[PDB]
Amino acid sequence: TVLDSILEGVRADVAAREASVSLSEIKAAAAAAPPPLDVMAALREPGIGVIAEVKRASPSAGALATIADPAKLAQAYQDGGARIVSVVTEQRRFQGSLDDLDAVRASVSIPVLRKDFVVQPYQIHEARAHGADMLLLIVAALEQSVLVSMLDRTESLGMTALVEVHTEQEADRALKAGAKVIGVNARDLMTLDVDRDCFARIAPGLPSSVIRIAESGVRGTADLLAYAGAGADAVLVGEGLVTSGDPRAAVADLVTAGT
Numbered sequence: 001t002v003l004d005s006i007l008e009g010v011r012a013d014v015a016a017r018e019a020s021v022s023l024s025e026i027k028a029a030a031a032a033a034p035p036p037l038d039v040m041a042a043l044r045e046p047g048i049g050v051i052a053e054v055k056r057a058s059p060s061a062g063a064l065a066t067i068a069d070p071a072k073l074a075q076a077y078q079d080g081g082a083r084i085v086s087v088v089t090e091q092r093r094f095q096g097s098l099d100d101l102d103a104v105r106a107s108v109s110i111p112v113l114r115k116d117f118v119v120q121p122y123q124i125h126e127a128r129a130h131g132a133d134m135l136l137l138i139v140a141a142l143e144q145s146v147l148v149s150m151l152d153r154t155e156s157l158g159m160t161a162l163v164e165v166h167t168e169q170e171a172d173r174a175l176k177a178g179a180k181v182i183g184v185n186a187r188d189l190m191t192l193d194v195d196r197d198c199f200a201r202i203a204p205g206l207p208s209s210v211i212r213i214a215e216s217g218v219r220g221t222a223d224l225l226a227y228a229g230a231g232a233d234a235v236l237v238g239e240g241l242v243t244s245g246d247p248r249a250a251v252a253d254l255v256t257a258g259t
């Protein structure tokens with residue numbers, strides 16, 4: 001129910017933003033934004049893609065990094081060979097913001113994933129207006145009807161949905177919703193326990209055409225390689241990178257893992 005408390009805060013925060021920037025305005029801004037980058041093409045490039053994340057804090061970790069300059073962090077990520085930059089935009093528990101998404105979008109050429117708790121259409125157009133190419137949808141957070149709607153709207157704007165699951169049953173739901181990219185989060189968003197075997201148990205079940213992403217818990221090359229050996233097409237890493245004194249070198253180490 002960490003997840004439930006997060007969603008309560010998110011719904012209130014979204015409503016307050018919408019009161020200042022209307023749904024019509026954000027839809028217009030999204031329509032006017034330059035088209036999203038082809039995330040699927042990025043994910044199909046050779047090698048295990050590293051999705052490097054901008055995250056200042058989390059429920060499980062508390063404060064991780066000040067990240068006064070998220071653009072400069074993202075530039076390091078791209079310099080290190082990251083495939084995609086993930087930007088956490090949730091304010092109350094992760095100390096992120098849409099400002100971070102703008103800063104990162106303006107600083108890198110690689111695709112940008114908005115990492116937040118998407119529960120209503122407003123957030124989807126908002127992500128697009130602020131330059132997101134990829135958008136997280138969390139199966140644990142969304143009733144199937146809502147998941148399918150959110151996925152449809154995401155794709156309608158040309159963005160790719162990263163549909164996040166923690167169980168086989170959630171993976172089955174993701175497939176039925178039309179997921180083309182499925183992320184397995186090793187962290188249980190309810191209880192905050194990290195189980196890195198999740199990906200290995202779930203990944204084999206997926207149609208080969210679905211892109212598989214392993215999220216969370218990567219401390220170094222060994223963890224990345226373990227995910228790759230279980231079939232990950234990409235791996236998403238936050239804590240180990242944001243706490244680095246040399247994010248460029250840390251990313252490059254992961255990017256070149258197994259060489």
Ligand SMILES: O=P(O)(O)OC[C@@H](O)[C@@H](O)c1c[nH]c2ccccc12
Pocket residue numbers: 053055088094115116117136164185215216217218236237238239240
């Ligand atoms: O810092 P880690 O253990 O490398 O994990 C990164 C990422 O997977 C995690 O921050 C995350 C996974 N799903 C999310 C949803 C919202 C915010 C954050 C996340």
Ligand SMILES: Nc1ccccc1C(=O)O
Pocket residue numbers: 002003058059060061187189192
């Ligand atoms: N990434 C998360 C998403 C939801 C709740 C907690 C976390 C965490 O890392 O602590």
